[PDB]
C-alpha cells in the first residue's frame, strides 16, 4: 500500500466578527432594552439618558434609523437557540465605525463601494427598505450555511 | 416586656398529589407524545402498540375521552415555567384509580358524589363540556393562587 | 436594579405626618414605631426580630 495526506481550509469569518485592525470604535456604555439582540445584526437607540449617560438600544424595526452593529464577545454574551446573543437588561458592545462581518439574506455578490440596504429585522439584504450610509467592503463568504457580508460603517 | 408565641398552619394539598392510601392503581408503562403534560391534568390515549405494549398519551383535547391523571414524582418530572411537567419522549405516571388532587377553574364548593366535568384543557370546571364518570371526593382546598379539588377515579 | 425603596415585597406603612405646620407629634411617632416593630415581630411569626432603625 501507499500512504496519503490530506488538506483542509478553515472558514474565513464568523457573524459579528471584526474584519480587520483598521481604525475602529466601539461603544460599551449601552444597555439592551425590552428584548434580545442577535450577534451580527444592526441595533437602534431608543433613548439616551440626560445625566446618567447610558444609551438604551434594541433590535431594529421599520421606520427607524440604524446606529451600530453588535460584535462577538466570549464574556458578555449568552448562548440561546444554538447561537450567541445579548440578553435583555445587560451591557452590549456596539461597533460604531470600522469593518465588520454581518449576517445577510441576499443571494448574489454585492458591488464594492455601493450603499447598504437593510431589512426590517436588521440583517443586510439587497433591495431592502431601510436606507443607511454604510458601504460594502468587498467580502462574500458562507460559513456552514450562514451567509456573511463585510460592511464599512461610518459614525452617524 | 412579656414573651409571646405564634401559630401557623401547613397547607394540605398540591397539584397532582395522591390524596390518601386507599386502593389505587398507577400505569407507568406509558409514553407521552406530541407535546408536554402538566402535573395534575387529565390525559388521553392516542394509540396502543400491539406488540411492544406501550401506550401513547397526550393532553386532553376537544371531543376526546380522558384516561387518567398525571401525578407528582421528584425523579421523572422536569421543572419548567415554575412547575412540574412531563416533557416529550419520556416515561410518564398516569393514575387510573383512587383519590387525587386536580387543578380546578371553578369558584364554588362541589357536591359530594356528583359527576366530574372537565374543561377542554384537562382541568376541572363546574360547567365543562367534556363529561366523565369520576366523582368528587369532598375535599376542596386552595394553595397560593391555585385551586385544587379531590377527584376519585375508577378504571375506564 | 431595584432599590430598597422600590422592592415589591417589603412591608409598607402609610403614616400621618410627624411634623405638621411646625408642630411635633411624638405620640404619633411613638405609636407608628411600635406598630412597625410589632409588625416585624408578627409577620415572621417570631422567627425574626427588629434590631435597627
Amino acid at each position: 500500500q501507499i500512504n496519503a495526506s490530506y488538506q483542509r481550509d478553515m472558514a474565513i469569518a464568523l457573524p459579528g466578527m471584526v474584519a480587520d485592525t483598521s481604525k475602529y470604535n466601539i461603544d460599551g456604555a449601552c444597555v439592551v432594552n425590552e428584548g434580545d439582540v442577535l450577534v451580527g445584526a444592526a441595533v437602534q437607540v431608543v433613548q439616551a439618558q440626560a445625566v446618567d449617560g447610558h444609551k438604551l438600544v434594541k433590535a431594529l424595526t421599520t421606520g427607524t434609523t440604524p446606529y451600530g452593529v453588535a460584535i462577538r464577545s466570549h464574556w458578555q454574551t449568552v448562548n440561546a437557540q444554538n447561537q450567541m446573543i445579548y440578553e435583555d437588561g445587560g451591557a452590549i458592545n456596539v461597533m460604531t465605525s470600522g469593518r465588520v462581518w454581518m449576517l445577510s439574506k441576499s443571494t448574489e455578490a454585492p458591488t464594492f463601494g455601493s450603499a447598504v440596504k437593510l431589512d426590517v429585522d436588521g440583517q443586510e439584504k439587497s433591495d431592502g427598505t431601510i436606507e443607511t450610509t454604510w458601504t460594502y467592503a468587498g467580502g462574500w463568504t458562507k460559513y456552514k450555511d450562514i451567509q456573511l457580508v463585510e460592511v464599512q460603517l461610518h459614525q452617524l | 416586656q412579656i414573651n409571646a408565641s405564634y401559630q401557623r398552619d401547613m397547607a394540605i394539598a398540591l397539584p397532582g398529589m395522591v390524596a390518601d392510601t386507599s386502593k389505587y392503581n398507577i400505569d407507568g408503562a406509558c409514553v407521552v407524545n406530541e407535546g408536554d403534560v402538566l402535573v395534575g391534568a387529565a390525559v388521553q390515549v392516542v394509540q396502543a402498540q400491539a406488540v411492544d405494549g406501550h401506550k401513547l398519551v397526550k393532553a386532553l383535547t376537544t371531543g376526546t375521552t380522558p384516561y387518567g391523571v398525571a401525578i407528582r414524582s421528584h425523579w421523572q418530572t422536569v421543572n419548567a415555567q415554575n412547575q412540574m411537567i412531563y416533557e416529550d419522549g419520556g416515561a410518564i405516571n398516569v393514575m387510573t384509580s383512587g383519590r387525587v388532587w386536580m387543578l380546578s377553574k371553578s369558584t364554588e364548593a362541589p357536591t359530594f358524589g356528583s359527576a366530574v366535568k372537565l374543561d377542554v384543557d384537562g382541568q376541572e370546571k363546574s360547567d365543562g363540556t367534556i363529561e366523565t364518570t369520576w366523582t368528587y371526593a369532598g375535599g376542596w382546598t386552595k394553595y397560593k393562587d391555585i385551586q385544587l379539588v379531590e377527584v376519585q377515579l375508577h378504571q375506564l | 436594579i431595584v432599590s430598597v425603596f422600590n422592592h415589591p415585597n417589603i412591608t409598607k406603612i402609610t403614616s400621618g405626618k410627624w411634623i405638621d405646620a411646625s408642630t411635633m407629634k411624638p405620640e404619633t411617632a411613638e405609636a407608628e414605631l411600635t406598630q412597625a416593630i410589632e409588625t416585624i415581630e408578627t409577620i415572621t411569626r417570631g422567627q425574626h426580630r427588629a434590631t435597627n432603625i
Binding site: 464568523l14 457573524p15 466570549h74 454574551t77 449568552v78 448562548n79 444554538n82 447561537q83 450567541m84 460559513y143 456552514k144 450555511d145 450562514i146 | 408565641s5 405564634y6 401559630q7 401557623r8 398552619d9 401547613m10 | 415572621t44 411569626r45 417570631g46 422567627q47
Partner: peptide, 27 residues
C-alpha cells in the same frame, strides 16, 4: 449550524452554600 462561545453558562456560576427553610410553629 452552531456558533457559541468557549465556556458554557455553568462554568461561570455560583451557588450559595446555605439554604432557607420556612418556619411553622407548633403551638
Amino acid at each position: 449550524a452552531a456558533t457559541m462561545g468557549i465556556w458554557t453558562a455553568q462554568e461561570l456560576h455560583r451557588i450559595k452554600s446555605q439554604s432557607y427553610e420556612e418556619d411553622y410553629p407548633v403551638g
